[PDB]
């Protein structure tokens, strides 16, 4: 049977479960030709890793696979939206369908094209000049040869601001229909497993969501449409079964839900990845006004390649300590001021000519300003822009006022502040390292690491491409979905009923078949 | 070799052969090997310090052109920042090499009319492009060596 | 380094103990070995 084994190598799943009188087991089940296809593809694989990164970071060992199947409920969503786009007034439809559909497939290159326009509107703009007499103040262009560039900036600005307005269109058709899914099925759980709005009370994101439950279309895109009738029963008899049914409320424009639009704009306008792509536009209008504003678009190089993001992410995340230090270097520069203002005012004289004395320190709102603008930027302490105390009457006292500056506020403090940052950078990235491991040695379905399947050859590439393969459990979860429910076999029900009750105990948690069958195998 | 022919032509080209001290003792190779291997991040940073020095230029070019006057004599004003292909060149040649930010080769805003606004244009340079960035770039390297 | 110390405490608690000896390579086999064996059995607040 060699050829039929090798014809069905990629289509034969294999999944180990736990239960049915406390043992382990092997389940065998058919993989389709299309779930194997649209999981190998990059827009999705991505997410995988993603999930992998953070849940190895801030997950314990308890709540981990409450997050897993919270994730496998998502990738089986937009997988169902990837096929949503793959290839007189009625023909508006076919255009409207075709246009945005085949648009949003294009998307990621539609943006990267935006960037490369910004690397021309700046360079081409890096030629200006001003002068007293035009070709008052007059601004023209230089371009001493090639006298058609100065026109090109008019067809490289009406071709950018267009490409901004696409991405706003592309986003609102490819990505938001997840970011209300992942809200609605975050609410309905917390309204039917511990009843937020019905026996406890609200976090503003809670309070904002009262606006929807009245509406007649609450499960708009999260599968279900019964949750309502599910919580007029569970938490519904003790409370007024007429009282709750109030709380829920038990062409296009002629019947558009007046409420629930205002909600749906609620969570998008608060979502960062959208709320950026407005700023990225509304500058690009302002360009036309002043035409240097297309310099701002150049800042996208931080939200780009991995290292560059870390650059800025680093600068922020330790901001707890950092701002609270600079809130101290602005203080211990005060104290010197009060000392300077009282005793050493005679020296702070920047007057190069004796006819007009200048006396930087009389008004302490200046002498505090003078110290923090040329006394931390001179790298030689404050005694670098002052007369010197060679002469007399305070010299000794003065030469300890300085060399205590130098030490504190230019050797300790400015060392700290470069420090925090640079090493914080280093540490975000070491984390990226520990994930990289944790995977390799141990696990991520069972418990054990690799001191057990090290004894046999290739214990890794068997026990993570044969037995505990973290990708089979999304094929199961969506092979289960569509078997006609009256022929779930002997294991394939007891999972499926242990699933709609959320008990997450059909996950091995430290065993393999080679785990109790060590003696028999 | 082919340098060592060119020597005969100009005779200083036998200075180039002196560079072999990098492909020599173990530590010295690591010196240069280090400098490269992290080049993924490194070049992609210096490709940012050449940008956030641009932004200041655009700000300087529009509002504070009056100060960028290196003319030691009032008969021949010099005005380093008129053509933005210069004021972008002036910043990245004496405004990251002076260790005191850009407000070290300029008139000072004691007098008026922008002083406050001007003294935050500078001390935001100093911080970003001489305390964060130039710290990063020594950093990458030295610790990569380590 | 003062602050990395603040880090090692943060751990030492999580893995091991602070009444008995053992760490968590023993109550790892069963589900939720932590939140049983430190809110049920060896709970460092019961002994007050
Ligand atoms: N316990 C585990 N469960 C599941 N997968 C594991 C486990 N241990 C290692 N692996 C796998 O080692 C794999 C190596 O990566 P893989 O080639 O399969 O795709 P990838 O992670 O996205 O990286 P790449 O795209 O370059 O291939 C990891 O993806 C991971 O799936
Ligand atoms: N061996 C142990 N004995 C007692 N407690 C333990 C042990 N291991 C972990 N813990 C507990 O994990 C707990 C997590 O903190 P906990 O929520 O209970 O209060 P906390 O330490 O003061 O922090 P927080 O106020 O934010 O809640 C620790 O307080 C600690 O009591
Ligand atoms: C559990 N489950 C899902 O989690 C799911 C679904 N259709 C989509 N979702 C996401 N079906 C039909 C389902 O039984
Ligand atoms: Ca049956
Ligand atoms: Zn495993
Ligand atoms: Zn204990």
UniProtKB/Swiss-Prot annotation, chain B:
Q: Which residues carry this modification: Phosphoserine?
A: 71
Please list the residue ranges that the record places on the Cytoplasmic side of the membrane.
Answer: 26-40
**UniProt-annotated location(s):** Sarcoplasmic reticulum membrane
Q: Which residues cross the membrane?
A: 9-25, 41-61, 125-145
According to UniProt, the tissues expressing it are described as:
Detected in skeletal muscle (at protein level). Fast- or slow-twitch skeletal muscle.
* Lumenal-side segments: 8, 62-84, 105-124
Domain of life of the organism encoding this protein: Eukaryota
Q: Where in this protein does the record say Phosphotyrosine is found?
A: 68
Motif range for Selectivity filter?
Answer: 99-105
> What post-translational events are described?
The N-terminus is blocked.
Which stretches of the chain are intramembrane according to UniProt? Answer: 85-104
Q: What is the effect of changing residue 30 to I?
A: Decreases threshold for channel activation by K(+), caffeine and 4-chloro-m-cresol. Decreases inhibition by Mg(2+)
The record's domain comment reads: The calcium release channel activity resides in the C-terminal region while the remaining part of the protein constitutes the 'foot' structure spanning the junctional gap between the sarcoplasmic reticulum (SR) and the T-tubule. Pore opening is mediated via the cytoplasmic calcium-binding domains that mediate a small rotation of the channel-forming transmembrane regions that then leads to channel opening.
Q: Describe the task this protein carries out.
A: Cytosolic calcium-activated calcium channel that mediates the release of Ca(2+) from the sarcoplasmic reticulum into the cytosol and thereby plays a key role in triggering muscle contraction following depolarization of T-tubules. Repeated very high-level exercise increases the open probability of the channel and leads to Ca(2+) leaking into the cytoplasm. Can also mediate the release of Ca(2+) from intracellular stores in neurons, and may thereby promote prolonged Ca(2+) signaling in the brain. Required for normal embryonic development of muscle fibers and skeletal muscle.
Q: What else is known?
A: Binding of [3H]ryanodine indicates that the heterozygous channel is activated by Ca(2+) concentrations 4-fold lower than normal. Single-cell analysis of cotransfected cells shows a significantly increased resting cytoplasmic Ca(2+) level and a significantly reduced luminal Ca(2+) level.
The family annotation for this protein states: Belongs to the ryanodine receptor (TC 1.A.3.1) family. RYR1 subfamily.
Under the subunit heading, UniProt states: Homotetramer. Can also form heterotetramers with RYR2. Identified in a complex composed of RYR1, PDE4D, PKA, FKBP1A and protein phosphatase 1 (PP1). Repeated very high-level exercise decreases interaction with PDE4D and protein phosphatase 1 (PP1). Interacts with CALM; CALM with bound calcium inhibits the RYR1 channel activity. Interacts with S100A1. Interacts with FKBP1A; this stabilizes the closed conformation of the channel. Interacts with CACNA1S; interaction with CACNA1S is important for activation of the RYR1 channel. Interacts with CACNB1.
Q: What is the recorded name of this protein?
A: Ryanodine receptor 1
What organism does this protein naturally occur in? Oryctolagus cuniculus
Q: State start and end of the fragment within the whole protein.
A: 4796 to 4941 of 5037
